[PDB]
Design a protein around this ligand. Structure first.
Ligand SMILES: O=C(N[C@H](CO)[C@H](O)c1ccc([N+](=O)[O-])cc1)C(Cl)Cl
Ligand SMILES: O=C(N[C@H](CO)[C@H](O)c1ccc([N+](=O)[O-])cc1)C(Cl)Cl
Length: 160
């Protein structure tokens, strides 16, 4: 059914990907420095500051997006901006794209570790990363757009 492929993100993908977050909570989980409503400009700003922006495609549709927000050659990468089209949630897109990013971190950055940080309210993410072999290492305090304290669960996984 799901026949996923991947390639580097392109300008022509921005409007699609900027359509993915469906509410302020979803935007905060995947891009906590963004301001609702999301926009192509905000997405392009991230892409410029980051590395490895990659889309996942199925049946001619861009269904996922991810990048690295930290990269340290021979050391680790940290995954962020993981977004999935609302019509394709729970179909394997995030897990597919995390595997692609793991490979890119190993191959291009010679990373030994991938870091993922997940906000506490994002249960789906915490469970998914757990299923993929990520372990929690620390919890950091952050604040949401209403000034409320949230917990950022910092996880990692050795790259094999
Ligand atoms: O789907 C969710 N989380 C996934 C888990 O991998 C991920 O964190 C995510 C976050 C934002 C998003 N988006 O805004 O399009 C999509 C997936 C929760 Cl919003 Cl239920
Ligand atoms: O700033 C620009 N380009 C950079 C890369 O040089 C990047 O693509 C970017 C785009 C939009 C942006 N924004 O509007 O926040 C920030 C950076 C153009 Cl607006 Cl000139």
């Amino acid at each position: 059914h799901m026949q996923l492929s991947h390639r580097p993100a392109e300008t022509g993908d921005l409007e699609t990907v900027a359509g993915f977050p469906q509410d302020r909570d979803e935007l905060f989980y995947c891009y906590p420095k963004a301001i609702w409503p999301f926009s192509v400009a905000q997405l392009a700003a991230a892409i410029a500051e980051r590395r490895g922006s990659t889309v996942a495609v199925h049946d001619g549709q861009v269904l996922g997006f991810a990048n690295f927000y930290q990269w340290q050659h021979g050391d680790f990468c940290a995954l962020g901006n993981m977004m999935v089209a609302p019509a394709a949630r729970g179909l394997g897109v995030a897990r597919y794209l995390i595997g692609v990013m793991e490979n890119l971190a190993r191959e291009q950055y010679k990373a030994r570790l991938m870091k993922i940080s997940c906000f506490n309210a994002n249960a789906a993410g915490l469970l998914l990363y757990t299923q993929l072999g990520y372990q929690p290492r620390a919890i950091a305090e952050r604040h949401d757009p209403d000034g409320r304290r949230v917990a950022l669960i910092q996880m990692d996984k050795p790259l094999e």
